[PDB]
Amino acid sequence: SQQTRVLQEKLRKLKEAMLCMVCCEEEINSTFCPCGHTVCCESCAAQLQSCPVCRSRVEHVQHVYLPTH
């Protein structure tokens, strides 16, 4: 039905929000510290000197283990 299409859309959007904002291919699993934006995979986060959301300098990257992984 149309509700199946709506739910497929919500599920897709929630899954897309768990993907890296830079490469769009790998799951987010990394946090820029100290700002706390958690928007990248480990490969993209290793290559950024400043946060792509707030432009704060990245002092270090913290790997995150999420139950959604």
Ligand X SMILES: C[C@@H]1CCC[C@H]1NCCO
Q: Footprint of Zn ion on this chain (CB under 5 A)?
A: 20, 22-23, 26, 35, 37, 41, 44, 51, 53-54, 56
59 binds ligand X (CB under 6 A): no
Tell me which residue of 37, 30, 27, 32 sits closest to 49, measured CA to CA: 32
67 touches, from Zn ion, ligand X, its own copies, none (C-beta below 5 to 8 Å by class): its own copies
Residues 6+ apart with CB under 8 A from 61: 30, 31, 32, 33, 42, 45, 46
Among positions 10, 16, 55, 63, the unique one binding ligand X when judged by CB under 6 A: 16
The encoded tokens of residue 34 equal 């100290």
19 binds ligand X (CB under 6 A): yes
